């Protein structure tokens, strides 16, 4: 597992997660004294290679609650009318352990917007979890269960999912700023070696906002341009080499001279 020292890149988002998670669990008395509501689960959208899933493995390392996972499309099933059974037999396993976070990495396979010409069992099992979150017995389930889901682009989905009453926050994980991009180098570099007379902010400012995970690719690749030569240690010019390269090909097919317009 990984931890919060490694998810650097931000604090405003993560400082909003345990605004809903850690407080009701440890300290609902003020929130019962204030006695207003109970804010339930959360969604976090952003482009890929940004740290969505990363925050969700860390949090389990720093939760004290039980943390249930479902990966991509292990609920859609062959026979009929048991996908729902695979759902309602989930939450009942949660309420056994009253503090219970769940997690589902992606929903765009399940929770896509509905139609009639096609889309069968999947548009049904969505139509009962949507019940379980905020129904009669869902009010019972609504006590202590919390939910996290991590899409990529949310316009696809229904509103009913991200409708409040059950999704009270909709977090953005955008691609970072210079200093955010600059630090996570160190978070993927400190293992490396006594890097020799080096700067790393002068190179981040070269590479404008592309993504985060790409930065894990330049650092691992930079050592590899030093690994071939039995040069265990690390260079400067190997960095602005690689980052100047691996995004070139990403800027290779973007060109087009159709130009039926201006």
Ligand X SMILES: Nc1ncnc2c1ncn2[C@@H]1O[C@H](COP(=O)(O)OP(=O)(O)OP(=O)(O)O)[C@@H](O)[C@H]1O
Tell me the binding residues for ATP: 46-53
Comparison of 183 and 214: residue with beta carbon closer to another protein: 214
DSSP reduced 3-state for 102: strand
Residue 125 binding target from ligand X, another protein, none, CB below 5 to 8 Å by type = another protein
Q: Is 119 in the site for another protein (CB under 8 A)?
A: yes
User: For residue 41, what are the contacts with CB-CB under 8 A and spacing of at least 6?
Assistant: 20, 102, 145, 146, 147, 148, 149, 166, 167, 168
**Residue numbers belonging to the annotated binding site:** 46-53
DSSP reduced 3-state for 171: strand
CA distances in angstroms from 62 to 4, 104, 106, 205, listed in the order given: 8, 18, 22, 33
Q: Is 221 in the site for another protein (CB under 8 A)?
A: yes
Residue from 63, 123, 152, 236 touching ligand X (CB under 6 A): that is 152
Residue 191 binding target from another protein, ligand X, none, CB below 5 to 8 Å by type = another protein
DSSP annotation of 114: P
Q: Is 192 in the site for another protein (CB under 8 A)?
A: yes
Comparison of 160 and 226: residue with beta carbon closer to ligand X: 160
Residue from 70, 76, 90, 130 touching ligand X (CB under 6 A): that is 130
Residue from 156, 186, 201, 202 touching another protein (CB under 8 A): that is 156
Q: Is 178 in the site for ligand X (CB under 6 A)?
A: no
Six-digit token string for 138? 């869902």
DSSP reduced 3-state for 167: coil
- Closest among 102, 47, 109 to 75, alpha carbons compared: 109
Residue from 11, 62, 64, 74 touching another protein (CB under 8 A): that is 74
């Amino acid at each position: 597992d990984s931890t919060y020292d490694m998810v650097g890149g931000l604090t405003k988002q993560i400082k909003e997660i345990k605004e809903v998670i850690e407080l009701p669990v440890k300290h609902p008395e003020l929130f019962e004294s204030l006695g207003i509501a109970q804010p339930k689960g959360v969604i976090l959208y952003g482009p890929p290679g940004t740290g969505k899933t990363l925050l969700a493995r860390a949090v389990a390392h720093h939760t004290d609650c039980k943390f249930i996972r479902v990966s991509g499309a292990e609920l859609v099933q062959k026979y009929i009318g048991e996908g729902s059974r695979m759902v309602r037999e989930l939450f009942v396993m949660a309420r056994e352990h009253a503090p219970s976070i769940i997690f589902m990495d992606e929903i765009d396979s399940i929770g896509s917007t509905r139609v009639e010409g096609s889309g069968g069992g999947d548009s049904e099992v969505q139509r009962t979890m949507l019940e379980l979150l905020n129904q009669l017995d869902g009010f019972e389930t609504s006590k202590n269960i919390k939910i996290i889901m991590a899409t990529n682009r949310l316009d696809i989905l229904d509103p009913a999912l991200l409708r409040p009453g059950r999704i009270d926050r909709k977090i953005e994980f955008p691609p970072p700023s210079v200093a955010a991009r600059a630090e996570i180098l160190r978070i993927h570099s400190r293992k490396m070696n006594l890097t020799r007379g080096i700067n790393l902010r002068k190179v981040a400012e070269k590479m404008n906002g592309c993504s985060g995970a790409d930065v894990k690719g330049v650092c691992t690749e930079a050592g590899m341009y030093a690994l071939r030569e039995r040069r265990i240690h690390v260079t400067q010019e190997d960095f602005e080499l690689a980052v100047g390269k691996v995004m070139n090909k990403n800027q290779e097919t973007a060109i087009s001279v159709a130009k039926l317009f201006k």
